[PDB]
Amino acid sequence: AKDPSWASILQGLEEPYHTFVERLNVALDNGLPEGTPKDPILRSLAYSNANKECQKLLQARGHTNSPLGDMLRACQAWTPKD
Amino acid sequence: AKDPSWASILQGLEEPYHTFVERLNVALDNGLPEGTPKDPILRSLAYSNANKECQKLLQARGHTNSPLGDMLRACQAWTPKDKT
């Protein structure tokens, strides 16, 4: 039983963080079973499967009423090398 | 949009990593809807909800066909500052 496709979505080393989060959001929207809450799974995977540089930025992210927004904001100044 | 309880399971600053992962495993067994694959979500939370010291150890973990085992092994020698 291979893992679902949404479990192997990894941020590219040159991929903008917001693009990765958008891809992951759609994969979970489409692939998580009915009645499974997407939001907390998205937030966890958007950290654990982010690239190494963005994981460091995410560890120091904010603590607001918009927890997904806090993750995007923490990486908003990050620039891929290429 | 109150998150489920399994999503607020956080490794204490003084909590052994294996005990934290077990608490995640139980919370998902009882909280995650029956039929949603637990293992990828357990592995994800075992990083995202881990304490900073164990997150650093996890950064150097291996890359095998046993990804949860890689996480457990990476933190298997970490001991909290207060053992009580």
Numbering used by the authors:
A (entry chain B): 128 to 209
B (entry chain A): 128 to 211
Sentences from the study reporting this entry:
Human T-cell Leukaemia Virus type 1 (HTLV-1) is an untreatable retrovirus that causes lethal malignancies and degenerative inflammatory conditions. Here, we show that high-resolution crystal structures of the mature-length HTLV-1c CA protein define essential lattice interfaces and identify a distinct ligand-binding pocket. However, our structures reveal that HTLV-1 does still have a pocket formed between helices 3, 4, and 5, albeit an electropositive one capable of binding to either phosphate or sulfate in vitro.
To obtain higher resolution, we expressed residues A128-L214 (CACTD), which were purified as a dimer and crystallised in space group P212121 with diffraction to 1.47 Å resolution. The structure revealed a short 310 helix followed by α-helices 8 to 11. The asymmetric unit comprised 6 copies with two possible dimer configurations: one mediated by helix 9, and the other by an interdigitation of residues R188 and H190 in the 10-11 loop. Comparison to the HIV-1 CA CTD dimer crystal structure suggested the former as the biologically relevant dimer interface, but this was not unambiguous due to structural differences in this region. To improve the CA full-length structure, we re-solved it by molecular replacement searching for three independent copies of the refined CACTD structure as a search model. This unbiased approach returned a CTD dimer virtually identical to that mediated by α-helix 9 in the CACTD structure (RMSD = 1.580 Å), suggesting that this is the biologically relevant dimer interface. The positive dihedral value observed for our CTD dimer supports the presence of the immature arrangement in our crystal packing. Y113F was chosen in order to remove only the hydroxyl group of the side chain, which binds to a water molecule, bridging this residue to the sulfate/phosphate groups. Lastly, while we were confident in our assignment of the biologically-relevant CACTD dimer interface, we decided to test mutants at both this interface (Y174A), and the alternative interface suggested by the interdigitation observed in the CACTD crystal packing (R188A, and H190A – see Supplementary Fig. 3g).
